[PDB]
Design a protein around this ligand. Structure first.
Ligand SMILES: O=P(O)(O)C[C@@H]1O[C@H](CO)[C@@H](O)[C@H](O)[C@H]1O
Ligand SMILES: [Mg+2]
Length: 218
């Protein structure tokens, strides 16, 4: 049986992927880049703050100075951080709280594998920190998704092999990272975005311990 579940945060535990989208779009438009729509934003889900900014700049073949790049990343984060101050336990997605409880009862380890430096703050907002056996710190993991490093680190932090872990993700980059870590991915979202070659569920109510067992058995 699987021995750990490795959680992305944004778009898996709560609806903060939507907040990142809105904040990146606002930044892009301030600098005259209008191509950050929902479709393009699929390329920003799960990706580090700077790699995200650079994708936006490349989208438009725009070059800014090193000083401006730093200011832009900070500008978007400062906005995003204001946007999430009122997140609360009521914003936890359906199924997630009960899944965490059920995993702990069954002695299955729980680790965070989020790109976000805002992860710990959000878990505190949602009264979820106590469910987590570890948080892989993305500042300590240089390689962003789609590299597997953050999932490998999350598994290591709870003493479980990636091959005996499930990863939960809402993003293209993160699904690839899970695959390359050896863990088993279960995506949440639309097949048109996330593919048809792994298990994809349409919303997080589907993330029950019963279903994770169903998938693990196959
Ligand atoms: O919260 P941050 O440190 O800026 C890192 C954020 O991670 C998200 C994924 O969890 C990305 O979708 C987002 O583009 C990025 O800014
Ligand atoms: Mg995500």
């Amino acid at each position: 049986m699987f021995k750990a579940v490795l959680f992305d945060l944004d778009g898996v535990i709560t609806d903060t992927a939507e907040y990142h989208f809105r904040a990146w779009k606002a930044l892009a438009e301030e600098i005259g880049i209008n191509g950050v729509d929902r479709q393009f934003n699929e390329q920003l889900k799960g990706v580090s703050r700077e790699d995200s900014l650079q994708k936006i700049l490349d989208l438009a073949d725009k070059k800014v100075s090193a000083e401006e790049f730093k200011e832009l990343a900070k500008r978007k984060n400062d906005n995003y951080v204001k946007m999430i101050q009122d997140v609360s336990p009521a914003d936890v997605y359906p199924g997630i709280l009960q899944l965490l409880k059920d995993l702990r009862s069954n002695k299955i380890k729980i680790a965070l594998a989020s790109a976000s430096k805002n992860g710990p703050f959000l878990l505190e907002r949602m009264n979820l920190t106590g469910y987590f056996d570890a948080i892989a710190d993305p500042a300590e993991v240089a390689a962003s998704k789609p590299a597997p490093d953050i999932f490998i680190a999350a598994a290591h932090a709870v003493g479980v092999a990636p091959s005996e872990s499930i990863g939960l993700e809402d993003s293209q980059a993160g699904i690839q990272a899970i695959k390359d870590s050896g863990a088993l991915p279960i995506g949440v979202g639309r097949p048109e975005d996330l593919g048809d070659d792994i298990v994809i569920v349409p919303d997080t109510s589907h993330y029950t311990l019963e279903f994770l067992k169903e998938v693990w058995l196959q």
